[PDB]
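User: My advisor, Dr. K., asked me to get a structural model of this assembly before our group meeting. I'm new to this, so sorry if the format is off. These are the inputs:
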Amino acid sequence: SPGIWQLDCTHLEGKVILVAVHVASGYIEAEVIPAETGQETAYFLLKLAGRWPVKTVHTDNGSNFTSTTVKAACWWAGIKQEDGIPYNPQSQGVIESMNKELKKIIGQVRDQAEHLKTAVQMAVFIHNHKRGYSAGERIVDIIATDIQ
Amino acid sequence: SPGIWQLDCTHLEGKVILVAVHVASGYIEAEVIPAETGQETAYFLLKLAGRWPVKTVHTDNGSNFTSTTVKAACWWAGIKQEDGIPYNPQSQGVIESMNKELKKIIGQVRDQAEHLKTAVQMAVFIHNHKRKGYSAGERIVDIIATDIQ
Ligand SMILES: CC(C)C[C@H](CNC(=O)Cc1c[nH]cn1)Cc1ccc2c(c1C(=O)O)OCO2
Ligand SMILES: CC(C)C[C@H](CNC(=O)Cc1c[nH]cn1)Cc1ccc2c(c1C(=O)O)OCO2
Ligand SMILES: [Cl-]
Ligand SMILES: [Cl-]
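Assistant: The format is fine. Below is the predicted structure of the whole assembly, which you can bring to the meeting.
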């Protein structure tokens, strides 16, 4: 479980928000992209895997699962690509709830940021810092425990 | 020390590579940008602070230290902005050495990536995973975990 991440793609203001969730902790990383292509997803995963020990990724849809560029990035970074099928159906609800929460935070920071990308990063910050421990605290503890 | 980061700006292929180094561990995050503006630096810090517990940042130069946008981002994120003056002069050598190492890795991945930004992220990966023995990635997690307890 310490190396398991889930991809999540949500939409806002005619733009695409790509999210990676560390399943065990609820910690996230996110980016705004023009559209969800294999290339954008692949680049996002390369960034993620350089920053955290990503062992397995549950991909968000079949197009990214199939993408040769995504497969290339997973090979390069030592990531096992898996499907994101919610065999446990409560999975979908948790993700949907997070997307709602994230959009809510984004709305709350609109007097502060001119650009959506900035608001998304503010939302990442607030999500990861929210307290009981925070998601940021949980991911560090989970990984540290795993190293030692 | 667990919350202390240093900004570092280096140049390659007529482009700018902005780097944040976690001082105690040597762990890095980096991005390619067209040029080093206050706005780009500010955005970079917002990203960083959402991902790791950034308490203090030693800024890479006076323009970013002065920048109202950088100051706004540091205020927003709860970051103490400090200067990056190497009072301990060995500081500067360590950074220069890392920049050399990073450029070397970037050169080694040029048959693999079409775009510089991709090569930089590959270099971040290799740097953070490299065993010295623990890796920088392992060190930062241990340092922060120890601090939470
Ligand atoms: C830290 C924030 C509180 C402020 C900081 C600067 N923005 C403003 O001051 C806009 C404003 C607020 N009230 C009236 N105008 C946000 C920011 C930082 C860096 C960026 C940005 C933005 C952005 O605005 O999206 O865009 C890409 O690089
Ligand atoms: C995982 C890598 C080994 C490959 C992957 C795809 N690139 C190629 O296949 C180029 C090629 C042709 N012949 C040899 N290499 C890199 C990559 C991924 C995502 C991106 C990229 C790039 C990039 O190339 O910069 O640009 C922005 O989004
Ligand atoms: Cl790592
Ligand atoms: Cl954090």
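One thing worth pointing out at the meeting: Residues A 39, 42-43, 69, 72-73, 76; B 112-115, 118 surround Q31 (ligand 2) (CB under 6 Å).

User: Perfect, thanks a lot.
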